[PDB]
Design a protein around this ligand. Structure first.
Ligand SMILES: [Cl-]
Ligand SMILES: [Cl-]
Ligand SMILES: [Zn+2]
Ligand SMILES: [Zn+2]
Lengths: 30, 21, 30, 30, 21, 30, 21, 21, 30, 21, 30, 21
């Protein structure tokens, strides 16, 4: 099951709200 | 990091901020 | 936190995130 | 895995559509 | 309740209405 | 059910929810 | 037009079901 | 009105918390 | 756990973006 | 098909196109 | 790919999808 | 400006990839 793939989708949406104008970098690794 | 940390355990809004800026 | 208008389901997801374990109440008509 | 955390996010979005003007209360417990 | 009931088994739109109003 | 305009991906999620096992067809241009 | 009616106009749950298989 | 303030106007994280249980 | 139910929700949103004007058919089976 | 194929393994945007048109 | 305006969290999900393993950077203010 | 181009204007999948790492 692609649990991690699905979890990441939620994570980026949450960072979008949490970070706001500050933005963020999403790196599936380092 | 982000995935390892926040997918195996619930990161609140406060814990997620560490991945901003 | 983000600084933009939150509507429809985006407001609901924001509450879900912001409120955590506390849970929340959504009443668009009150 | 945060399956329950992810499931709840979908649940609130579904209630948003299903409940409409009636609104709803989300309580991770009682 | 909601989580226990609808996360371990698929709640249709009809089953979700019970959690409205 | 909700009483508002459904567009983009929100219309797709609504169909996904409303249709259940039946599945659905989405053709924005037809 | 699905998009024409449910996005530009409002669709009852009934009208929405017209697009289920 | 939650919808009236956070959707038609902007809500700080503080104002948003007014709707948590 | 409703993993498949949750996965499908993401899938239809992705097809919405990927397919665009071409649209798509979602059938939980054949 | 779609579910079996893309839920037990990550389908990229390119792999998802096969389910369009 | 879809041919419409992508804003807020929909732009973030699009990047998540389009970028895959590559990951992405979201900076709304730059 | 990502937001300036893909949200206020339309972005091809190509333009979108300009924001991948
Ligand atoms: Cl929107
Ligand atoms: Cl999920
Ligand atoms: Zn939206
Ligand atoms: Zn999900």
């Amino acid at each position: 099951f692609v649990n991690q793939h699905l979890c990441g989708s939620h994570l980026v949406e949450a960072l979008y709200l949490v970070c706001g104008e500050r933005g963020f970098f999403y790196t599936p690794k380092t | 990091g982000l995935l390892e940390q926040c997918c195996h355990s619930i990161c609140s809004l406060y814990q997620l901020e560490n991945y901003c800026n």
